[PDB]
Design a protein around this ligand. Structure first.
Ligand SMILES: Nc1ccn([C@@H]2O[C@H](COP(=O)(O)OP(=O)(O)OP(=O)(O)O)[C@@H](O)[C@H]2O)c(=O)n1
Ligand SMILES: *P(=O)(O)OC[C@@H]1C[C@@H](O)[C@H](n2ccc(=O)[nH]c2=O)O1
Ligand SMILES: [Mg+2]
Ligand SMILES: [Mg+2]
Ligand SMILES: [Zn+2]
Ligand SMILES: [Zn+2]
Lengths: 186, 73, 929, 188
RNA sequence: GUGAUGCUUCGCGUGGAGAAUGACGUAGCAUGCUACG
RNA sequence: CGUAGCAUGCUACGUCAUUCUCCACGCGAAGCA
């Protein structure tokens, strides 16, 4: 505690104590200095205690406002924060199937239903282009989620069956994209 | 060795699905809950990862719900 | 073989019965059978070895053995004369097995022989013992009984856990097939008694003197009397048979017209609710010679012992009556001229019909108290609601209060990625690590609350051994003699949290604070006095719990109405606070585990047992499978502290309110009302203490069964032998309470069966020598008691035993024990599962809690919990606590940095430097304070 | 404090003492004027302590009055809400059938569990699977509780309207079970 | 829409007992000095 | 040696200003069972 009106009184009295004791003065002066110094000490203690209480109250209020602000920030941005966290964790996992399906989704090739796990498994996968088709499909086998599937039918944008032979680099402009390939797990 | 990462990731994934209002579909939410709880009660890493792929298929199926390209820079 | 074949022909006795011996010639056969014996030497219901009978099995006309035996008994001439005279009196009775008295020249003298003809292989004693001492390891009499009477097929036991009520509910059906046989036995018993009464024969009826066809034999201890003054004694018979009458559902035939299983069910009047005369007719039909008064309505009972006695019979008989007849009895009152429908009574399965004493018709106004009572009552809600046929459950559905069914899901927990990243950076969660994440927040779908409520199907009507229960209740109340109870005033009540739910329908206008502020102490005392004279049926709201666990289960708790909770507090809080303020007792509720409390509790339970072993158990689905009789007994034990403040009627009406509110009340589970079959409503004012009473009752019952089912001749200790004899006398031969023997048995249990009870958790330090000799209960006895008195099979994965007491109990309140050098002496410290603490750190139930900087006291509490792991000999468990300390330091640093960035201040708050040093947490387990 | 005249008396005494000291005190009586100052200080401090105590007690009493008024004002709110709910339920139950069954009662009391069974005009059946559907509420009309119910509506767990033709053995996997069937008591 | 009870940590407030420093009033023991008798 | 008045040292009680240990309760937050 410094820069208080009673702090200067304390400094002056305590500095004068050394002079009084070392000045060879009478003990009446000693009692006078004791009285003045102790009175200033008590007054400065009162002022310092009140100032400490004010600082403590300021600290508490500041902490509470910080907590409310942080809680509001944390709750408001829950959605985007959770999504970013999810994809950071997925990237850290570095699994073959997860990376495969995530890359296909980034390219626009997404499923229309939960990717089944059993052998008796019907999966419908959308395909928005011929390039992704040829990259992720060839012949009558469809590689997806680090697994092999056997195609059954492709039904184009407007529902209409398409034979596999009808999908090719020359034939791509004719077809009505996007396509929907339904396949069975290998 | 990628067995506590999968369970935490499944928790975060089901939280994200819940944020995307998937409980509005009783069947889809039931399947999501089944996958999540099975992954949590899993000892085999391969079973957990296949269930994780199935669970992530729910998020990836809804094309417009999330913007994958921005999320995965 | 001429002598043997001649003996075989003589046993036929004119009745061509195609006999084939069971032993070599005339040599007497030996079998190991259950006998309910009591004489000057031994007393008990145990398996003895009989070697004084020759069995000749009768075979069908096609050489197929049938269940008909000719048991030939060899006698002294005196008893041969005595039994012949009694039989000649009892010959005309159709419930008496045919006897043939003859004399056979064995070697050189005419030895007397008494042939009981066409007897079943097993007796009623064998069935009762097999079901009351069930051991999955060796249950061959039970299997043979089931197969022999076509209850099931011999391959039915190839299942795993075929005997488990939870894993294999179909076992109930298999047991129900026996019911009719048991019923016939009961009927025949009555006939036999009548014959005795008409023949002037005085004797004791025992289960082992009746076969599974209902026929009776023996007559060895029957004595002549005036022809019309016969006095059958049936206490042991009926009391030992009682637990089997509900397991086998014997009285199911009573639900059919003409009491015939072929004919259809009786079509009772739908508006009928008073079956008092039907209950009396059932009692006279079956328990005619049970010589203690039965009150169909327990409002007329003399004391709590009489109440339990008659409630047992009411439990048995209520299974015959339609479920729609039980519940609030709603009358039409007129208030201010408008017609209300208000519950003016209640039909209890156990207590019969109760009618409110203050039913004010033509009321002029409703005050706050009356308005609250009417709002609580399910009369208006059920009467004005739609009809519900919820097929998702078997519990009786009453009404749908809303036009849409509510499907409430459970959402997953929030992942604290900061703490998890920190942990993995500090070498956690690696493959092969002993510490791995096992506690999560499991999500649930819409059918979550209803699916968990459906677990009340494990609650079954359980008739108890009443003579045994009336002694067990006294011994259990001996455990609650160091406590002070009694009603208190509304101003003396302490409410821990007033920001909790007030129940239904009161949760749609405020919390409990609203109704504790709106209700004046005058109003609260008026409501209490009302509940002392009237029954208030309340609605219980089933609420899902959002908690972290290792088991994929959605716990549901009961939010009980504010009206019920207020009065229950005012009625029980004095006793509950006395219980929680007591140290060193059996019930250790209110005892802290910090500052040496764990060590004190363990040293107290150890006491001075001679050969100390530890054992412990958990009740599977404790609240869902608790019998109604045991819950009523627990409530009566708690209410017995009201001998100076409440009269008999006041205590009974408080019991009736407790039953109507937290035993079989109306349950609101998803906007619809259902009827709870029974069991505790976890969420009432006394859940933790009723559970403790129930646990102590089960333990005392296990000890009683262990001591009475022990061959008395094999007890080398005369004190224990006389104690067993007196125990049998006090159960099945004394009607009043023998306080001296109750104190003797309590002292015996305390000396050899020291207990430490906290709700459904228990730790027993027991004398292993006595347990091995069968003098005190072992874990097998506890399983046997639970099977027939709780309708739950207890597996060994739910129980544990510890030979070395320096290891402490294996688990208690989810805490493990470690004996660690703390200063100059070794102390027992509790430590949790490291996975539990790590899951608490990593997974939370609030988005704001995933930011650790705001929640630092949370991690301080977690570190306080995790401290005793530093003393563990495993370095991973020890590192768990240091992980929390380091993360607390990091959180404080981050908080200081954020406060410096957002503001232009300096926290310089290292009074918090004590939160990342071990002394703050080490001081929490030292006995200083 | 300042309002109290004791503070004024102390101020006058202190001003007099300060003026006497500045002008030059005699010798030993300046100690006596300081003594008067000290007496004033003690008495004024004692008065001010009671001043603060009474002020804070009055503040506590005002807070108590505010809380009591709020409690009495919320009691009225909850009373009115309970009365409104009770009146709504009164005007929500059919009086004809209820009166008939209550009059058929031998003494006046009836089981509560039969009131909806015999008087409810609308039934709600929750079907978990298709086998239960075919067993319980197949067709447009069905018999339950010794009464005939005409199916009014069917919805799924998502509250989507379901046509009775949609419910079929092959189409069951496509429905969001359980189904809620709302039916009306036919001809009362 | 989130129950009953137990224990524990933290923050805040009021209250009681007690410790320390200091101002200061009354009374009393007691040292020194002026005046009256 | 008594009385009045004035001054110095030591001690008891009473009331205040400040701090802190322990506690009884109240309120808020949290953790575990
Ligand atoms: N949040 C909780 C948890 C438990 N209990 C009480 O503790 C008893 C038993 O707890 P627990 O054994 O954990 O529940 P169970 O129903 O027995 O489940 P489990 O089969 O695992 O033993 C219950 O009867 C319940 O009333 C409670 O009141 N509140
Ligand atoms: P822990 O192993 O959770 O339970 C030990 C014991 C059993 C139970 O009755 C009681 N308990 C536990 C948890 C809870 O939330 N409430 C409660 O009463 O303590
Ligand atoms: Mg349990
Ligand atoms: Mg437990
Ligand atoms: Zn009775
Ligand atoms: Zn009482």
């Amino acid at each position: 505690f410094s820069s208080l009106p009673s702090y200067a009184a304390f400094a002056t009295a305590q500095e004068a104590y050394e002079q009084a004791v070392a000045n060879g003065d009478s003990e009446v002066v000693l009692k006078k200095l004791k009285k003045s110094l102790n009175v200033a000490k008590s007054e400065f203690d009162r002022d310092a205690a009140m100032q400490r209480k004010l600082e403590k109250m300021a600290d508490q209020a500041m902490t509470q406002m910080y907590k409310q602000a942080r809680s509001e920030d944390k709750r408001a941005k829950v959605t985007s924060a959770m999504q970013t966290m999810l994809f950071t964790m997925l990237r850290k996992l570095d699994n073959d199937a997860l990376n495969n399906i995530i890359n296909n989704a980034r390219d626009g090739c997404v499923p229309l239903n939960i990717i089944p796990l059993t052998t008796a498994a019907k999966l419908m996968v959308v395909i928005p282009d011929y390039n992704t088709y040829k990259n992720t499909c060839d012949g009558t086998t469809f590689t997806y989620a680090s697994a092999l599937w056997e195609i059954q039918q492709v039904v184009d944008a407007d529902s209409k069956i398409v034979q596999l032979s009808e999908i090719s680099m020359d034939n791509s402009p004719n077809l009505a994209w996007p396509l929907i390939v339904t396949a069975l797990r290998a | 060795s990628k067995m506590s990462d999968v369970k935490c990731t499944s928790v975060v994934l089901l939280s994200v699905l819940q944020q995307l209002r998937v409980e509005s579909s009783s069947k889809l939410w039931a399947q999501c809950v089944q996958l999540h709880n099975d992954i949590l009660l899993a000892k085999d890493t391969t079973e957990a990862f296949e269930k994780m792929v199935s669970l992530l298929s729910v998020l990836l199926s809804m094309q417009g719900a999330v913007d994958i390209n921005k999320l995965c820079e | 073989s001429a002598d043997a074949q001649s003996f075989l022909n003589r046993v036929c006795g004119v009745s061509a019965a195609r006999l084939t011996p069971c032993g070599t010639g005339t040599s007497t056969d030996v079998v190991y059978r259950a006998f309910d014996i009591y004489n000057d030497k031994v007393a008990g219901f145990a398996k003895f070895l009989k070697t004084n009978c020759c069995r000749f099995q009768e075979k069908d006309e096609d050489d197929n053995l049938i269940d008909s035996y000719f048991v030939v008994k060899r006698h002294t001439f005196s008893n041969y004369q005595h039994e012949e005279t009694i039989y000649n009196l009892l010959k005309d009775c159709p419930a008496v097995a045919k006897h043939d008295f003859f004399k056979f020249r064995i070697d050189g003298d005419m030895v007397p022989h008494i042939s009981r003809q066409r007897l079943t292989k097993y007796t009623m004693a064998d069935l009762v013992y097999a079901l009351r001492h069930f051991d999955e390891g060796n249950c061959d009499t039970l299997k043979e009984i089931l197969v022999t009477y076509n209850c099931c097929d011999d391959d039915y036991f190839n299942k795993k856990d075929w005997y488990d009520f939870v894993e294999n509910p179909d076992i109930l059906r298999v047991y129900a097939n026996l019911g009719e046989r048991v019923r016939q036995a009961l009927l025949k018993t009555v006939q036999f008694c009548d014959a005795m009464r008409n023949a002037g024969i005085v004797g004791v009826l025992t289960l082992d003197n009746q076969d599974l066809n209902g026929n009776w034999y023996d007559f060895g201890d029957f004595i002549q009397t005036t022809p019309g003054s016969g006095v059958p004694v049936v206490d042991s018979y009926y009391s030992l048979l009682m637990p089997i009458l509900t397991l086998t559902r014997a009285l199911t035939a009573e639900s059919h017209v003409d009491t015939d299983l072929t004919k259809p069910y009786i079509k009772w009047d739908l508006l009928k609710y008073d079956f008092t005369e039907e209950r009396l007719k059932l009692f006279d039909r079956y328990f005619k010679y049970w010589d203690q008064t039965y009150h169909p309505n327990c409002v007329n009972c003399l004391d709590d012992r009489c109440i339990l006695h008659c409630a047992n019979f009411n439990v048995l008989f209520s299974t015959v009556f339609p479920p729609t007849s039980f519940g609030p009895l709603v009358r039409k009152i007129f208030v201010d001229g408008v017609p209300f429908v208000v519950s003016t009574g209640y039909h209890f399965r156990e207590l019969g019909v109760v009618h409110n004493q203050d039913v004010n018709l033509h009321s002029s106004r409703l005050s706050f108290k009356e308005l609250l009572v009417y709002a609580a009552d399910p009369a208006m809600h059920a009467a004005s609601g739609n009809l519900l046929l919820d097929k998702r459950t078997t519990c009786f559905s009453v009404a749908a209060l809303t036009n849409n069914v509510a499907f409430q899901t459970v959402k997953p927990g929030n992942f604290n990625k900061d703490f998890y990243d920190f942990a993995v950076s500090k070498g956690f969660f690696k493959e092969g690590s002993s510490v791995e994440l096992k506690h999560f927040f499991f999500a649930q779908d819409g059918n979550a609350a209803i699916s968990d409520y459906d677990y009340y199907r494990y609650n079954l009507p359980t008739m108890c051994d009443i003579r045994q229960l009336l002694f067990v209740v006294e011994v259990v109340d001996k455990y609650f003699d160091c406590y002070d109870g009694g009603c208190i005033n509304a101003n003396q009540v302490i409410v821990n949290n007033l920001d909790k739910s007030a129940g239904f329908p009161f949760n749609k206008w405020g919390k409990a604070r609203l109704y504790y502020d709106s209700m004046s102490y005058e109003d609260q005392d008026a409501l209490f006095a009302y509940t002392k004279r009237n029954v208030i049926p309340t609605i219980t709201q089933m609420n899902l719990k959002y908690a972290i666990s290792a088991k994929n289960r959605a716990r549901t708790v009961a939010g009980v109405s504010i009206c019920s909770t207020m009065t229950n507090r005012q009625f029980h809080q004095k006793l509950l606070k006395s219980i929680a303020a007591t140290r060193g007792a059996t019930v250790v509720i209110g005892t802290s585990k910090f500052y040496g409390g764990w060590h004190n509790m363990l040293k107290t339970v150890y006491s001075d047992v001679e050969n100390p072993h530890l054992m412990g158990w958990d009740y599977p689905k404790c609240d869902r499978a608790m019998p109604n009789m045991l819950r009523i007994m627990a409530s009566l034990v708690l209410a017995r502290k009201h001998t100076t403040c409440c009269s008999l009627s006041h205590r009974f009406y408080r019991l009736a309110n407790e039953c109507a509110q937290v035993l079989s009340e109306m349950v609101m589970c998803g906007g619809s009302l259902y009827v709870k079959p029974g069991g505790t409503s976890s969420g009432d004012a006394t859940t933790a203490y009723a559970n403790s009473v129930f646990n102590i009752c089960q333990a005392v019952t296990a000890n009683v069964n262990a001591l009475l089912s022990t061959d008395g001749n094999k007890i080398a200790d005369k004190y224990v032998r006389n104690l067993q004899h007196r125990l049998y006398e006090c159960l099945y031969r004394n009607r009043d309470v023998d306080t001296d023997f109750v104190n003797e048995f309590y002292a015996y249990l305390r000396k050899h069966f020291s207990m430490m009870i906290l709700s459904d958790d228990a730790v027993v330090c027991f004398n292993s020598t006595y347990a091995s000799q069968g003098l005190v209960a072992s874990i097998k006895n506890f399983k046997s008691v639970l099977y027939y008195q709780n309708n739950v099979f207890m597996s060994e994965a739910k129980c544990w035993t510890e030979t070395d007491l320096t290891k402490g109990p294996h688990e208690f309140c989810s805490q493990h024990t470690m004996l660690v050098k703390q200063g100059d002496d070794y102390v027992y410290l509790p430590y949790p599962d490291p996975s539990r603490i790590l899951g608490a750190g990593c997974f939370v139930d609030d988005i704001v809690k995933t930011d650790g900087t705001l929640m630092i006291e949370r991690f301080v509490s977690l570190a306080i919990d995790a401290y005793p792991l530093t003393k563990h000999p495993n370095q991973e468990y020890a590192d768990v606590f240091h992980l929390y300390l380091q993360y607390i330091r990091k959180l404080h640093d981050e908080l200081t940095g954020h406060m410096l960035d957002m503001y232009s201040v300096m926290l310089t708050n290292d009074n918090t430097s004590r939160y990342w040093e071990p002394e703050f947490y080490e001081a929490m387990y030292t006995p200083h304070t």
